[PDB]
Design a binder for these strands. Structure first.
Length: 476
RNA sequence: GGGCC
RNA sequence: GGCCC
């Protein structure tokens, strides 16, 4: 986005500056080029001259203004994708009740009771539990009044900037490229879930190539579905964006919201309004208040879905800006936020599409840095999606999600205090697809200290998960 | 938020 | 609680 105003008010919004992450026994074995992100300006690991609060917002450098012709084309592409989207999902997009928005419906998880409430509740020392009853699904007097202001469309708010305590590559830790979470007020999150939660649940349930969304997928079971689909096409592209979320221009955001969330598709009129409030935002970091135009906040409800929808429209837009006669059936794609795999039987020049993505303020590069550009003839077994490769399991003939060993090693090298055992069981479900030799090697440092699931038990679990009949047929 | 285990 | 985004 674009930083348009910076103010210094005499009210501190104090941020966390101490990491919950600590090295594990595996850290001394794998020695990863990774570490916890810098949360303080006085972190000794930082380069001698890095100003963390400047590097945090450095992603906001532009809000690209699209021409009249480009805006018209974008609207056309947004309407065409929305047509496809709502044809598959249906038009049952009525507002969620206050109860259902908190408790969650089929395909939508419940709201977290003990997470950050946002502003101005954080300054008043209030939590989410004090403002909202998460057991009975009811709201207090404060949230009640705020919801009525949103209905009148007169509600205004500020985003609370939070440092993301996570493992990052050492080069980015040293540079101070700490990621940020834009924590929105809890009532804004609730009302967004009221406005588009039904839609959001449907997209999770109907995830796949047909809607171009993998949001709500289970890579264990869905890699077979995704893998066999993309295997049918002549060309497959692994496309990377740089600062996707930040580089969404106001024009693209506004037009998308206008075309996708129309009342004629079953939405409440305020669905479009509440999403449009994410375009021009105020951010609170300590004493400074930063006004940003364009870009997507990360703490907003349905950021993954919004980013995914934009990704789908971007591809159609760029192809239509370059080629004549492009439709939704010209290609196929799957997206999860900024992450994307594209495929076609046509030999599409993705290198030529670069300036067309630039007209949206987006920068595309091939994932693999072997070639000096995009090349044809790649298959599904060459690309990465959700940090996972597409590998064939020789035992079953099904596609399996394989994460790189260096990634798994980095994951296993750090943990939040008192969570190591629970973490190991989770990572074991990821590591099983690397094979018995690699699985054993990854969990060797933990042996005798924690319970590690056998490779066998997790393999048999996976076979039944992907195909129940195949597991039963093995007992022929 | 947003899912999946 | 963990992973991915």
């Amino acid at each position: 986005g674009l930083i348009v105003d910076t103010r210094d008010v005499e009210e501190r919004v104090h941020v966390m500056r101490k990491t919950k992450l600590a090295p594990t026994v595996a850290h001394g074995v794998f020695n990863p080029e990774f570490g916890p992100a810098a949360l303080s300006n006085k972190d000794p690991r930082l380069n001698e001259g890095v100003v963390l609060d400047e590097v945090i917002f450095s992603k906001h450098k532009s809000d690209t203004k699209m021409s009249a012709e480009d805006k018209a084309l974008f609207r056309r592409c947004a309407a065409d994708y929305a047509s496809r989207l709502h044809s598959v999902l249906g038009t049952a997009n009525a507002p969620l009740s206050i109860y259902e928005a908190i408790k969650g419906v089929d395909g939508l998880d419940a709201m977290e009771p003990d997470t950050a409430p946002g502003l101005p509740w954080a300054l008043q020392g209030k939590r989410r539990g004090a403002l909202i009853d998460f057991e009975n699904g009811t709201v207090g007097p404060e949230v009640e009044a705020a919801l009525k202001l949103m209905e009148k469309r007169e509600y205004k708010f500020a985003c609370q900037t939070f440092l993301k305590d996570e493992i990052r590559p050492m080069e980015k830790v040293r540079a101070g490229k700490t990621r940020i979470v834009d924590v929105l007020p809890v009532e804004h999150i609730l009302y967004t879930r009221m406005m588009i939660g039904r839609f959001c649940a449907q997209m999770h349930s109907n995830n796949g190539p047909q809607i171009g969304s993998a949001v709500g997928c289970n890579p264990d079971v869905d890699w077979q579905r995704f893998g066999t689909h993309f295997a049918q096409y002549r060309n497959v592209w692994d496309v990377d964006y740089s600062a996707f979320d930040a580089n969404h221009c106001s024009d693209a955001m506004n037009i998308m919201f206008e075309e996708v969330f129309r009342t004629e598709f079953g939405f409440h009129p305020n669905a479009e309004w509440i999403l449009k409030t994410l375009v021009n935002t105020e951010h609170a970091y300590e004493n400074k208040r930063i006004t940003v135009e364009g870009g997507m906040p990360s703490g907003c409800s349905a950021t993954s879905i919004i980013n995914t929808i934009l990704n789908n429209i971007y591809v159609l837009y760029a192809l239509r800006r370059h080629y004549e006669g492009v439709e939704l059936d010209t290609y196929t794609m799957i997206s999860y936020g900024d992450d994307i795999v594209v495929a076609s039987d046509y030999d599409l020049d993705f290198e030529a599409l670069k300036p067309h993505f630039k007209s949206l303020g987006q920068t595309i590069t091939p994932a693999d840095k072997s070639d000096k550009g995009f090349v044809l003839g790649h298959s599904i077994t060459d690309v990465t999606f959700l940090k996972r490769h597409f590998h064939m399991d020789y035992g079953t003939g099904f596609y399996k999600p394989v994460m790189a060993s260096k990634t798994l090693e980095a994951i296993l090298s750090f943990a939040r205090r008192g969570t190591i055992q629970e973490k190991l069981i989770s990572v074991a479900g990821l590591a099983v697809h690397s094979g018995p030799d690699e699985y054993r090697r990854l969990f060797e440092p933990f042996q005798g200290l924690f319970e590690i699931p056998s490779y066998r038990s997790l393999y048999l679990r996976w076979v039944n998960a992907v195909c129940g009949d195949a597991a039963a047929l093995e007992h022929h």
